[PDB]
């Protein structure tokens, strides 16, 4: 780090990570920092021996990175390649050939250098870039006449007669291949007879290809770009050839026509324009242009059936015992539950790539976890300085003063919510829930049940999903039997508050939720808690306890629903989700109405009892 003239940080380096993993193997992370470095708890068992091997690699990578810096004369560069190969590589039956080739090229280069008696030192960047050019200069033409059809480029002085001669890639600019002279060469200034040029070489190879053809000559080139549907041009050679053909021949029945019309007619008759796609039915019409690939025959014939509707009614019987965690995981996302639980389909996306640079700002799940830790520490009235030092040793926070400023801002923002929570916090313990609803038994555990009520807090923005989880827990608590109210204090003064309810109403709403869960297990329950939640927030009126009907409010609710579903450029909307894409690729007004109806029916009590 200091070699690149950058300020020494001491974190986010291979040494830092290695020391961290070793400390985590030695000391559990629960203990704390030892040398301002948080031990990495993951590597704790015998598997941590891998670390010992990895730390053996980097050390080597260190040593050599110091040895190769200084310039050396040629004779000193001789044992470098062999030493590096035997140190870094363990040969095998297949790789031995490549290692021998590398050694041979390196030794040949250094042998030429020593035969030239170059005394001065040579930097590694020269030999590396020379070996890179020398290694790929090789070509393999040992299968030119093996027996199968020959595929090869146009090479000068290779003229062999063949019955069928095909030519590809004749687009203007690709062929002939142009290699201009260095510019200070004296030969190109005053040329004489016998001077060779790549242009004339290709121009003569095109004639050799024509003369060598005994039976059939095939020429092809790209006319239109597949990407942009633009127009390309063929080589000047093909152009002169087709011009000569059209000027030297005439089709039967065109005797009356003049020279130009007959020439154009011949040129259009010989030039064949193939389709853009293989499944084009024109390829399969009877004729000389008829294809031989039957795989694209049913597609060209348009005989396939379209994909039927993914939604299908499936039989389901509700068991006698349903854990509360099942209902919670269902109501978190009803469609994702039907996909993951009912038919066991999981769409696991690939994990994110390692970030290129050390964290400068904190956003997303990282800052969310940091805020969660900070909040859970502040509500317990613990020292924030300990957590700050812990995160600094972990390296998650930015370097130096910026990390302190970020921590101070987050501390203020979380201290507001912590004061709000401590205002109402009381000592509470967990409890067990055994309940019966609609002939279905629910068994679960509820944590932090204080005599006052169900108190929950999360450092997130006010969202409908959290309200639904709290409402399910509240119905469970009320139906179980207790005198309390449900509260949830979310970021930016968000508040979800539910008053106590009688046992009968609690059981009724819980039975309704269980019925919805059963219907979801039968067919995918189209209930969007966020977009539909916005629709119901716009339509419903808390004062009259009745939803509006006027078409103006309907248009406003549709606009709000579309804004919630699609979303802005900065924040992705609720519609952008892997599960929703499977059900429909584009949102239709009928599906919109169905989602609105279901979401209203299911979320009406949430907005009703929210105060």
């Amino acid at each position: 780090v200091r070699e690149l003239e950058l300020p020494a940080t001491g974190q986010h380096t291979w040494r830092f990570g290695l020391t961290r993993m070793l400390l985590g193997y030695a000391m559990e992370s629960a203990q704390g920092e030892w040398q301002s470095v948080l031990p990495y708890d993951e590597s704790s068992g015998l598997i941590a021996e891998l670390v010992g091997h990895l730390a053996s690699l980097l050390m080597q990578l260190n040593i050599w990175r110091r040895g190769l810096a200084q310039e050396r004369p040629l004779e000193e560069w001789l044992p470098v390649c062999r030493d590096m190969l035997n140190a870094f590589f363990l040969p095998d039956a297949e790789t031995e050939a490549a290692m021998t080739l590398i050694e041979q090229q390196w030794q040949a280069i250094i042998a030429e250098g020593l035969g030239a008696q170059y005394g001065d030192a040579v930097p590694l960047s020269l030999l590396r870039d020379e070996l890179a050019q020398r290694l790929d200069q090789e070509r393999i033409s040992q299968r030119f006449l093996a027996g199968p059809v020959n595929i090869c480029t146009l090479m000068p002085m290779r003229s062999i007669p063949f019955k069928v001669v095909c030519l590809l890639g004749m687009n203007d600019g690709v062929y002939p291949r142009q290699l201009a002279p260095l510019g200070f060469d004296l030969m190109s200034q005053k040329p004489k007879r016998g001077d060779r040029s790549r242009r004339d070489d290709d121009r003569y190879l095109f004639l050799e290809a024509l003369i060598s053809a005994q039976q059939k000559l095939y020429i092809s080139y790209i006319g239109r770009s597949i990407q942009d549907n633009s127009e390309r041009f063929p080589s000047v050679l093909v152009q002169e050839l087709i011009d000569y053909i059209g000027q030297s021949h005439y089709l039967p029945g065109d005797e009356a026509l003049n020279c130009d019309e007959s020439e154009a007619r011949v040129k259009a008759h010989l030039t064949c324009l193939h389709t853009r796609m293989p499944f084009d039915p024109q390829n399969y019409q009877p004729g000389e242009r008829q294809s031989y690939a039957r795989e694209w025959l049913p597609a060209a014939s348009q005989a396939g059936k379209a994909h039927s509707e993914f939604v299908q009614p499936l039989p389901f019987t509700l068991p006698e015992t349903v854990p509360l965690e099942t209902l919670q995981r269902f109501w978190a996302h009803p469609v994702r539950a039907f996909f993951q639980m009912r038919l066991q389909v999981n769409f696991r996306t690939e994990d994110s790539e390692i970030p290129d640079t050390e964290p400068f700002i904190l956003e997303g799940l990282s800052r969310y976890q940091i805020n969660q830790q900070l909040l859970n520490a502040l509500v317990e009235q613990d020292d924030a300085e300990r957590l700050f030092r812990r995160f600094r040793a972990a390296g998650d926070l930015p370097y130096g003063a910026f990390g302190e400023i970020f921590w101070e801002t987050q501390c203020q923002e979380m201290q507001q919510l912590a004061d709000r929570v401590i205002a109402c916090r009381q000592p509470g313990q967990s409890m067990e829930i055994d309940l019966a609803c609609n002939g279905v038994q629910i068994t679960g555990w509820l944590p932090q049940v204080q005599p006052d009520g169900l108190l929950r807090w999360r450092p997130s923005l006010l969202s409908v999903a959290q309200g639904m989880q709290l409402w399910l827990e509240h119905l469970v608590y009320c139906a179980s039997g207790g005198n309390g109210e449900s509260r949830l204090f979310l970021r930016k003064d968000g508040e979800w508050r539910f008053p106590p309810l009688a046992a009968e109403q609690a059981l009724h709403y819980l039975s309704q939720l269980i019925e919805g869960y059963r219907e979801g297990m039968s067919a995918p329950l189209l209930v969007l808690p966020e977009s539909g939640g916005a629709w119901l927030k716009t339509c419903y009126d808390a004062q009259n306890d009745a939803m509006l009907d006027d078409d103006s409010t309907l248009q406003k609710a549709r606009t709000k629903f579309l804004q919630a579903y699609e979303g802005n450029m900065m924040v992705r909307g609720e519609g952008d989700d892997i599960w929703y894409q499977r059900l429909w690729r584009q949102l239709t007004p009928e599906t919109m109405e169905a989602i609105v109806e279901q979401s209203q029916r299911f979320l009406l009590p949430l907005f009703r009892f929210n105060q």
């Binding site: 400390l23 704390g32 015998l46 010992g52």
Partner: protein, 601 residues
């Protein structure tokens, strides 16, 4: 400094690179004595030792070499504690100097946790002695002599945490069934939540089947039979161990919702998992452990069951002896002296084996091996016992004779294969003979023995084999990993054959039914002609044949041979040199842990 010297230890394969890197990082640029101490501590911790007494640091050959660099130290404690890398626990440091021993900060916490859990946490639960005695008499008819099963049940019912040690085939499962029956019958109205755990899925399924079949036989009402545990799980699944991260679903803050827990095969339970389990238990849960102390120790660093049962040799407490005599209605012997009353009372040892009689050669051989007396083992071999056999294996011509004997060993299985029988009988027959080798590769090892046996079955007509096919009919396989979809566990065997619909592998489920699986559907697997002594734990074979290499390796030890001997049901054969067997039995495996000192102080 000492870094250049430590670079040489890697070349001689004496010090692992992990240890070298750990020493270089933690010890830093302090005195070379600190670096050497750290390297030796890391090495001993990797090899399975928990602690490192400073007496051990007194003159490993590397230490003798580095004597010149470190010089002479009047007190190792002073030099070590002076550095920042070592402390007494006041401030978090990687290494901890506890008394006369050295610990890794991770190991020390788990050691202290296990110590305090076995010393102070456990309490004595009080119940009616007359009612308990009546229940146990209804469970155990014989009162003429001391029944160790009855004493074990009494101990487990009295104390909160109790461990029952005994050899294979000593009636452990039956004793646990009687224990759980008496426990359910004792508490009528109170909810009794029973949980069953095992460190391996195979042992978990075996525990499910055995406990079920045992509890169904004992007379119980529909109320009691409704509290029977549904299934037994793995320790990890019980604790909700996530695959990638080390976070536990049930941490210290979130206790397990259990009343009684039974962990089978505690011999494989290591120290870290033991501590993490202890951290998740509540204050009202009673825990019972099962395992054999002489059985091979756990893989990772640590040895809990052994270090615990080491104190069981002293015997019961004086007052506890009279208490159990009043309970069991017999005379219970009393251990002389008082060293640790709680631990000694929480331990019971089953000394009776119903499976094999004392007159059997297997039992006498196992006893002689456990006692470590080579002359006793040789005398047992010399005696006229029809169920023990020994063959000298020095030259390859004796290896060929061993293969010839393995031929007759697999004879019935091979005949049933060549006769086109049903897979059920073939699977039931395949478990009659098994080879057990210590090493994995080389001349004596699974990878080598499988190839040699296949070449020998190709030489003499037993089973046809295709080179390109790789799936010739008749080859047995075993699974490397657990699979919940197919319902097959790691360490379970299967037989690949062609019934006529196609080449499929048949497995025997714990319900007795046979399940056919496609070769493509199978996960990672390996040919199981010969098994390692480690993976052979829990299984039982009618005729077992152990193979010990000629070389001297730290793998071949006393506990390995003990497990290999106890592995067979009726017939056991050995292939090893006369001197190598004696040298292996003479050496006992030790894993240094402060438990011996902790429980005494």
């Amino acid at each position: 400094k000492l870094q250049k010297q430590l670079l040489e230890a890697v070349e001689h394969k004496q010090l692992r690179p992990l240890d070298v890197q750990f020493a270089l990082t933690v010890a830093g640029d302090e005195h070379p004595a600190v670096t050497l101490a750290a390297a030796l501590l890391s090495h001993d911790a990797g090899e399975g030792h928990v602690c490192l007494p400073l007496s051990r640091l007194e003159n490993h050959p590397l230490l003798a070499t580095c004597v010149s660099e470190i010089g002479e130290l009047q007190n190792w404690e002073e030099c070590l504690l002076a550095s920042q890398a070592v402390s007494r626990g006041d401030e978090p440091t990687p290494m901890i100097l506890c008394g006369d021993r050295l610990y890794l900060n991770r190991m020390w916490c788990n050691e202290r946790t296990v110590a305090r859990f076995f010393n102070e946490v456990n309490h004595a639960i009080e119940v009616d002695e007359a009612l308990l005695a009546q229940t146990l008499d209804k469970l155990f008819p014989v009162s003429d002599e001391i029944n160790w099963q009855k004493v074990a049940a009494a101990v487990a019912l009295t104390r909160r945490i109790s461990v029952i040690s005994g050899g294979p085939g000593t009636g452990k499962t039956t004793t646990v069934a009687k224990l759980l029956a008496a426990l359910i019958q004792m508490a009528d109205g109170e909810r009794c939540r029973i949980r069953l755990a095992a460190p391996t899925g195979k042992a978990a399924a075996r525990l499910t089947e055995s406990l079920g079949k045992a509890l169904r036989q004992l007379p119980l009402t529909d109320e009691q039979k409704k509290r029977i545990p549904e299934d037994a799980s793995t320790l990890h699944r019980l604790l909700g161990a996530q695959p990638g991260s080390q976070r536990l679903r049930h941490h210290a803050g979130n206790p397990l919702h259990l009343d009684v827990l039974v962990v089978d095969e505690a011999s494989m339970i290591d120290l870290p998992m033991m501590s993490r389990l202890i951290d998740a238990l509540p204050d009202h849960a009673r825990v019972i452990f099962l395992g054999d102390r002489d059985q091979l120790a756990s893989v990772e660093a640590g040895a809990v069951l052994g270090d615990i049962c080491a104190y069981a040799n002293a015997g019961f407490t004086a007052e506890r002896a009279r208490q159990l005599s009043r309970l069991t209605g017999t005379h219970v012997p009393a251990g002389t002296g008082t060293e640790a009353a709680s631990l000694r009372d929480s331990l019971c040892l089953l000394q009776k084996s119903y499976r094999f009689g004392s007159d059997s050669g297997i039992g006498q051989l196992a006893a002689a091996i456990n006692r470590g007396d080579k002359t006793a083992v040789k005398t047992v071999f010399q005696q006229d016992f029809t169920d023990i056999e020994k063959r000298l294996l020095q030259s390859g011509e004796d290896y060929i004779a061993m293969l010839e004997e393995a031929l007759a060993g697999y004879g019935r299985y091979l005949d049933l294969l060549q006769a086109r029988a049903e897979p059920d009988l073939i699977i039931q027959a395949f478990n009659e003979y098994q080879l057990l080798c210590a090493l994995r590769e080389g001349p004596f090892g699974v990878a080598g023995l499988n190839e040699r046996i296949e070449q020998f079955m190709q030489q003499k007509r037993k089973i046809h084999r295709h080179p390109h096919s790789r799936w010739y009919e008749g080859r047995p396989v075993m699974i490397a990993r657990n699979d919940s979809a197919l319902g097959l566990f790691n360490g379970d065997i299967g037989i690949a054959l062609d019934r006529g619909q196609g080449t499929r592998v048949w497995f025997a489920m714990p319900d007795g039914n046979i399940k056919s699986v496609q070769p493509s559907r199978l996960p990672e697997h390996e040919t199981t002609w010969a098994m390692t002594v480690h993976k052979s734990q829990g299984s039982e074979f009618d005729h077992a044949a152990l193979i010990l290499p000629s070389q001297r390796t730290p793998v071949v030890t006393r506990e390995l041979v003990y497990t290999a001997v106890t592995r067979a049901r009726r017939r056991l054969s050995l292939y090893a040199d006369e001197r190598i067997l004696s040298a292996a039995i003479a050496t006992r495996t030790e894993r240094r842990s402060g438990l011996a000192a902790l429980f005494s102080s």
